[PDB]
Scaffold this active site. Sequence first.
Site, PDB file in Angstrom:
ATOM      1  CD  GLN B  80      -3.163  -0.743   2.064  1.00 58.55           C
ATOM      2  OE1 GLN B  80      -2.843  -0.576   3.248  1.00 58.55           O
ATOM      3  NE2 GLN B  80      -4.413  -0.704   1.637  1.00 58.55           N
ATOM      4  CG  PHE B  82       2.519   4.785   4.173  1.00 58.28           C
ATOM      5  CD1 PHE B  82       2.212   3.461   3.891  1.00 58.28           C
ATOM      6  CD2 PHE B  82       3.367   5.052   5.243  1.00 58.28           C
ATOM      7  CE1 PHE B  82       2.730   2.438   4.665  1.00 58.28           C
ATOM      8  CE2 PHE B  82       3.888   4.022   6.011  1.00 58.28           C
ATOM      9  CZ  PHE B  82       3.566   2.720   5.725  1.00 58.28           C
ATOM     10  CG  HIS B  96      12.735   1.364  -2.915  1.00 62.31           C
ATOM     11  ND1 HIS B  96      13.610   1.808  -3.904  1.00 62.31           N
ATOM     12  CD2 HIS B  96      11.607   0.982  -3.549  1.00 62.31           C
ATOM     13  CE1 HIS B  96      13.029   1.697  -5.079  1.00 62.31           C
ATOM     14  NE2 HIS B  96      11.802   1.212  -4.890  1.00 62.31           N
ATOM     15  N   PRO B 108      12.373  -3.012  -9.036  1.00 63.61           N
ATOM     16  CG  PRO B 108      12.920  -1.471  -7.393  1.00 63.61           C
ATOM     17  CD  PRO B 108      12.173  -2.770  -7.597  1.00 63.61           C
ATOM     18  CD  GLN B 109      14.093  -7.046  -8.808  1.00 64.54           C
ATOM     19  OE1 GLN B 109      13.967  -6.145  -7.977  1.00 64.54           O
ATOM     20  NE2 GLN B 109      13.094  -7.847  -9.201  1.00 64.54           N
TER      21      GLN B 109
HETATM   22  C1  LIG Z   1       4.419 -11.167  -7.551  1.00 68.59           C
HETATM   23  C2  LIG Z   1       5.573 -11.236  -8.552  1.00 68.59           C
HETATM   24  C3  LIG Z   1       6.871 -11.011  -8.091  1.00 68.59           C
HETATM   25  N1  LIG Z   1       7.917 -11.065  -8.942  1.00 68.59           N
HETATM   26  C4  LIG Z   1       9.312 -10.819  -8.450  1.00 68.59           C
HETATM   27  C5  LIG Z   1       9.855  -9.425  -8.736  1.00 68.59           C
HETATM   28  C6  LIG Z   1       9.809  -8.735  -7.384  1.00 68.59           C
HETATM   29  O1  LIG Z   1      10.833  -7.731  -7.397  1.00 68.59           O
HETATM   30  C7  LIG Z   1       9.976  -9.880  -6.426  1.00 68.59           C
HETATM   31  C8  LIG Z   1       9.332  -9.781  -5.083  1.00 68.59           C
HETATM   32  O2  LIG Z   1       8.009  -9.271  -5.170  1.00 68.59           O
HETATM   33  P1  LIG Z   1       7.035  -9.975  -4.126  1.00 68.59           P
HETATM   34  O3  LIG Z   1       5.672  -9.359  -4.289  1.00 68.59           O
HETATM   35  O4  LIG Z   1       6.942 -11.443  -4.161  1.00 68.59           O
HETATM   36  O5  LIG Z   1       7.731  -9.803  -2.696  1.00 68.59           O
HETATM   37  P2  LIG Z   1       8.105  -8.419  -1.991  1.00 68.59           P
HETATM   38  O6  LIG Z   1       9.518  -8.094  -2.126  1.00 68.59           O
HETATM   39  O7  LIG Z   1       7.730  -8.789  -0.602  1.00 68.59           O
HETATM   40  O8  LIG Z   1       7.226  -7.269  -2.678  1.00 68.59           O
HETATM   41  C9  LIG Z   1       6.440  -6.416  -1.861  1.00 68.59           C
HETATM   42  O9  LIG Z   1       7.073  -5.100  -1.694  1.00 68.59           O
HETATM   43  C10 LIG Z   1       7.174  -4.348  -2.909  1.00 68.59           C
HETATM   44  C11 LIG Z   1       7.680  -2.938  -2.610  1.00 68.59           C
HETATM   45  C12 LIG Z   1       5.854  -4.254  -3.672  1.00 68.59           C
HETATM   46  N2  LIG Z   1       6.135  -3.615  -4.962  1.00 68.59           N
HETATM   47  C13 LIG Z   1       5.255  -5.601  -3.883  1.00 68.59           C
HETATM   48  O10 LIG Z   1       4.003  -5.416  -4.500  1.00 68.59           O
HETATM   49  C14 LIG Z   1       5.087  -6.281  -2.532  1.00 68.59           C
HETATM   50  O11 LIG Z   1       4.488  -7.564  -2.652  1.00 68.59           O
HETATM   51  O12 LIG Z   1       9.444 -11.074  -7.069  1.00 68.59           O
HETATM   52  C15 LIG Z   1       7.707 -11.400 -10.242  1.00 68.59           C
HETATM   53  O13 LIG Z   1       8.720 -11.497 -11.116  1.00 68.59           O
HETATM   54  N3  LIG Z   1       6.484 -11.674 -10.733  1.00 68.59           N
HETATM   55  C16 LIG Z   1       5.422 -11.630  -9.882  1.00 68.59           C
HETATM   56  O14 LIG Z   1       4.224 -11.866 -10.430  1.00 68.59           O
END
Ligand SMILES: Cc1cn([C@H]2C[C@H](O)[C@@H](COP(=O)(O)OP(=O)(O)O[C@H]3O[C@H](C)[C@@H](N)[C@H](O)[C@H]3O)O2)c(=O)[nH]c1=O
Lengths: 246, 245
Positions: B80, B82, B96, B108-109
């Site tokens: 979310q 803020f 971040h 970002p990566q």
């Molecule tokens: C959901 C999803 C994730 N990813 C990858 C790229 C992301 O950089 C990484 C992690 O994302 P994640 O959602 O599993 O885990 P997190 O690092 O916990 O990401 C969280 O904090 C971020 C600031 C937000 N932008 C995300 O929406 C939030 O879920 O996994 C993908 O390549 N494809 C996907 O469909």
Amino acid sequence: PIRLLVVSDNKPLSATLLQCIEALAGDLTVDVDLRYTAYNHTPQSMVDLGARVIDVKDESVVDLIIEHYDLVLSVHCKQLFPKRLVEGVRCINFHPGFNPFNRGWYPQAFSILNGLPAGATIHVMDEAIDHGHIIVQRQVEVGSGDTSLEVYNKVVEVEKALMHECLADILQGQYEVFKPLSEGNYNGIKAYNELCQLDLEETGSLRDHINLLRATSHGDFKNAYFIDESGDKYFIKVVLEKALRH
Amino acid sequence: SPIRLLVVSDNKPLSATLLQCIEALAGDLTVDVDLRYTAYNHTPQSMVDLGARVIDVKDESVVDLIIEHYDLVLSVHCKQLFPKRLVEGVRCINFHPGFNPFNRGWYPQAFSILNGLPAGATIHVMDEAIDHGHIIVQRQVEVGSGDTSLEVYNKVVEVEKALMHECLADILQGQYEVFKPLSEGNYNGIKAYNELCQLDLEETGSLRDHINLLRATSHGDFKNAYFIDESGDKYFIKVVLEKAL
Ligand SMILES: Cc1cn([C@H]2C[C@H](O)[C@@H](COP(=O)(O)OP(=O)(O)O[C@H]3O[C@H](C)[C@@H](N)[C@H](O)[C@H]3O)O2)c(=O)[nH]c1=O
Ligand SMILES: Cc1cn([C@H]2C[C@H](O)[C@@H](COP(=O)(O)OP(=O)(O)O[C@H]3O[C@H](C)[C@@H](N)[C@H](O)[C@H]3O)O2)c(=O)[nH]c1=O
């Protein structure tokens, strides 16, 4: 009592062939020798089937084959049979390609790049490679999602089906042969190594680039590579998955 | 008077590491932690296992009860944005997984693999705009030539944990010189990442460019990049790379 030499560097096809022959031992007596070739860098799976090495290019081995055997079956054999051997005794090759298209190395890999038919051919061996008159062949469809691995596994299953369907006729010479409609295209291992040697600067459609990776992706084989700014070599492959239909 | 800290996080490992760094301070400087996962988290079991409960950080009653009851809010990988009345109502600090202000926003990566701009981790004070505010600490991570989204992301997550062990005491206690980023670099929305995923098989470019698009959109078992063939069948495609031995 048909004296059969099988020359194979492929365990699963050799195992299938031995089983088909054993299943015919009711109607047809066959004495089988099984051999693998000098190019087999990793022969233990063949040794486990009772095989040992043969150098088919050795002139004394050629003499001895012509003397001791009625028929030679080449099954994914890594060695060129010399002229005097293929002219001296009946030699039949099981080729994992649809002759005369992508003759030579890793046919299904080229079929992914060029759209030419993929499949399996049983053919009389002449002096030239994957070139003699065809006994039977069957096409395999290349799917949009397929890599080299998926198309190769479908070719191997079709070869097993041809062995089961045709081995009795092949052993007994009960078949007609047909001349390929053209010479077709040949791919040597050099042409494959140039596929593997990626040019990061080369320009093309995303389609052609994905197709190049699909052609060079084969499970855990290390095929396609680039070398970066620091002279580090990286192998790259693609993995594909059909999306669930809803 | 112990520090009243709100941690808002949708990431279990980073939350786990934060709670661990906090009890490491238990001795010296004391903290009252409320751990919350966001109302945008539809698979929150891994946060619930950490004792987290839901917060909707856009419910006006919720943002009221926040300003009254906490000194500091840590955002760590939370789904979310803020509000304004929250981020001005308290010190709100974000962890971040990008090297601000390059490839701010989503994943970002992934965009760094495409556009070669620095990747890494940024702990930044939270202003009105996304990943914009004054920067406390940041570390670049190396984008390996053979790395996918997954490898770079895992390198960033470890640096985020490192920065937690190194900097948390000073972060809770105000002990830092925040700085303006030398510019405001570039932002990437969820739209832009999904536009990468929608491959165009007719698009023309370098094999480098195409491999970099696949690398950017390759992340372990996530189903990211896809094409549709002539018959309308959809396939996901990723790349798997290995340094030669
Ligand atoms: C959901 C999803 C994730 N990813 C990858 C790229 C992301 O950089 C990484 C992690 O994302 P994640 O959602 O599993 O885990 P997190 O690092 O916990 O990401 C969280 O904090 C971020 C600031 C937000 N932008 C995300 O929406 C939030 O879920 O996994 C993908 O390549 N494809 C996907 O469909
Ligand atoms: C050695 C090697 C194989 N492969 C893939 C593509 C091939 O079509 C497939 C099977 O090759 P294989 O050598 O592992 O196993 P086989 O299909 O039994 O290959 C054998 O009979 C062929 C008709 C000959 N051309 C081969 O030289 C010989 O080894 O595996 C690779 O992708 N890369 C590789 O380095």
